[PDB]
Amino acid sequence: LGIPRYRPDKAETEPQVGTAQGLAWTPVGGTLLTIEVAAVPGSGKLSLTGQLGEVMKESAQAALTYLRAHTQDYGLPEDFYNKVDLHVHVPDGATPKDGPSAGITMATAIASALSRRPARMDIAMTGEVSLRGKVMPIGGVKEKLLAAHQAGIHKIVLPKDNEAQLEELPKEVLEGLEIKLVEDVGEVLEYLLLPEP
Amino acid sequence: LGIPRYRPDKAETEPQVGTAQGLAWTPVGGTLLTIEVAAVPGSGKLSLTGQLGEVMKESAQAALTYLRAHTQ
Amino acid sequence: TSLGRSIARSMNRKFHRISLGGVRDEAEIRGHRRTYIGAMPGKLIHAMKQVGVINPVILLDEIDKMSSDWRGDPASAMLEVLDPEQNNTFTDHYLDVPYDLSKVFFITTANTLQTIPRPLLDRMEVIEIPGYTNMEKQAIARQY
Amino acid sequence: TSLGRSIARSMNRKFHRISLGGVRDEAEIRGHRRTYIGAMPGKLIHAMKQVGVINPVILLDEIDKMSSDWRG
Numbered sequence: 001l002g003i004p005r006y007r008p009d010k011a012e013t014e015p016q017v018g019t020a021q022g023l024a025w026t027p028v029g030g031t032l033l034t035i036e037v038a039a040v041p042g043s044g045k046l047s048l049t050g051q052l053g054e055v056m057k058e059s060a061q062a063a064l065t066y067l068r069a070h071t072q073d074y075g076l077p078e079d080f081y082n083k084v085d086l087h088v089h090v091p092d093g094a095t096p097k098d099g100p101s102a103g104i105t106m107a108t109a110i111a112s113a114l115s116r117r118p119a120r121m122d123i124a125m126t127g128e129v130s131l132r133g134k135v136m137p138i139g140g141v142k143e144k145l146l147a148a149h150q151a152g153i154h155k156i157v158l159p160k161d162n163e164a165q166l167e168e169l170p171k172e173v174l175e176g177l178e179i180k181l182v183e184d185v186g187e188v189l190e191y192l193l194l195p196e197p
Numbered sequence: 198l199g200i201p202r203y204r205p206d207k208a209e210t211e212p213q214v215g216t217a218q219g220l221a222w223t224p225v226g227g228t229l230l231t232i233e234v235a236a237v238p239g240s241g242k243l244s245l246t247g248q249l250g251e252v253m254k255e256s257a258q259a260a261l262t263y264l265r266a267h268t269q
Numbered sequence: 270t271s272l273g274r275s276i277a278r279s280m281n282r283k284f285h286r287i288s289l290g291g292v293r294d295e296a297e298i299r300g301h302r303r304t305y306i307g308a309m310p311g312k313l314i315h316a317m318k319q320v321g322v323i324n325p326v327i328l329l330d331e332i333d334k335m336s337s338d339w340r341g342d343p344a345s346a347m348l349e350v351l352d353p354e355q356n357n358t359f360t361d362h363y364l365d366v367p368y369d370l371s372k373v374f375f376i377t378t379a380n381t382l383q384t385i386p387r388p389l390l391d392r393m394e395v396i397e398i399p400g401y402t403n404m405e406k407q408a409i410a411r412q413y
Numbered sequence: 414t415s416l417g418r419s420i421a422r423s424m425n426r427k428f429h430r431i432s433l434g435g436v437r438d439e440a441e442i443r444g445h446r447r448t449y450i451g452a453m454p455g456k457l458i459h460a461m462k463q464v465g466v467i468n469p470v471i472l473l474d475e476i477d478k479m480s481s482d483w484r485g
């Protein structure tokens with residue numbers, strides 16, 4: 001055939017700061033979104049690209065809210081809401097999944113961008129962020145885990161309240177992928193960053 | 198049917214420490230509007246989210262003034 | 270723009286220039302919603318409408334003179350423009366189909382590098398065109 | 414304008430002028446695509462129409478009295 005259809009495994013995914021390999025849901029087979037964010041010193045203006053629906057803007061605002069609450073836990077700038085702009089790029093427009101496509105993914109991506117600390121690969125994370133830092137359970141985790149296995153990633157952290165879904169899916173999928181239970185975005189902050197802080 | 202799709206008889210709901218439960222009405226029947234409020238330190242402005250009109254803003258500001266007259 | 274003409278003579282494509290200075294609105298570079306008579310797209314879209322080939326030589330004019338008084342920067346749309354594979358994700362408001370600007374070879378112009386919008390500061394190669402001497406000006410006068 | 418008239422007389426071609434000032438849109442110069450009765454081109458086509466020669470001396474009046482807010 002010639003050129004491979006997709007980029008080589010673990011080649012398109014490298015440990016970087018602005019990248020965010022977040023699981024996504026699509027009607028004709030799940031995929032994974034490489035979310036990119038640009039955070040270098042500015043004035044606090046928010047930017048979105050990719051024919052996005054507005055719901056991602058509130059998800060980003062919730063992410064900024066959470067960062068403004070636990071800023072000093074990881075060395076983030078003391079007064080950054082008035083000194084740094086955020087420019088987020090999403091490879092697709094929006095997902096049919098109502099609410100944010102992946103809230104904790106964007107929150108951790110923006111936290112990494114502000115901290116300028118590379119995000120770990122070999123882990124794909126999806127879930128909806130809340131202003132109180134609570135990872136609300138997400139539906140349709142089946143295709144999420146299927147695409148994650150197709151992504152070559154075995155470590156997939158999921159919302160804590162989705163733990164019951166870890167008993168309804170077939171064992172052919174659950175056992176092949178490592179799963180952690182999380183409820184606070186601060187928990188996955190240490191699990192999607194190269195350094196502990 | 199599998200796992201309970203919905204939360205059990207509500208004696209212990211999700212951890213609620215910054216948010217409050219709320220009754221309301223919709224064309225599809227009543228719901229539970231657990232309103233989430235985040236108190237981020239800043240420049241003392243109101244930043245509503247959830248595509249809310251200014252009527253929601255004036256309700257919020259009425260609450261704000263009520264606490265501003267009952268601070269201590 | 271003479272360098273642009275020389276480049277388009279080398280590639281034998283069609284050359285074009287569009288002004289970008291004095292732009293204060295994102296809706297000036299992006300399109301407008303279908304909310305009035307004759308809703309208009311962005312400047313780049315109509316400039317493409319001027320051309321008839323999807324791989325011309327196109328030139329920007331003072332990209333460093335962007336402006337925006339509300340949230341978001343014009344550098345975001347221009348960054349979408351930067352990557353030819355991301356060009357297929359073009360922002361639009363009159364049309365909704367992202368155009369394929371991948372084969373549209375973009376060459377840029379900014380009289381001041383430090384006023385270029387800092388989201389567009391990555392992936393810039395400052396080819397500093399220098400000033401000209403008395404003898405150099407004499408020569409280019411006697412020749413061009 | 415009288416200078417323009419003198420110039421046109423010297424060139425012996427019929428003078429004309431059009432008050433292009435006070436035009437607030439691109440539509441009054443390009444018209445619009447004809448799709449209804451009362452489909453009208455721009456001012457320049459009017460000027461060339463009422464001057465029945467292909468080489469007039471048109472005076473763009475008040476060219477610095479335009480505005481650009483809508484319709485191009």
Ligand SMILES: Nc1ncnc2c1ncn2[C@@H]1O[C@H](COP(=O)(O)OP(=O)(O)O)[C@@H](O)[C@H]1O
Binds near residue numbers: 270271272409413
């Ligand atoms: N060494 C030179 N440096 C700059 N300009 C030159 C030189 N030699 C000749 N020229 C002439 O100077 C002109 C510059 O015009 P233009 O391209 O409109 O300037 P700009 O693109 O900076 O607005 C060109 O038409 C070109 O023929």
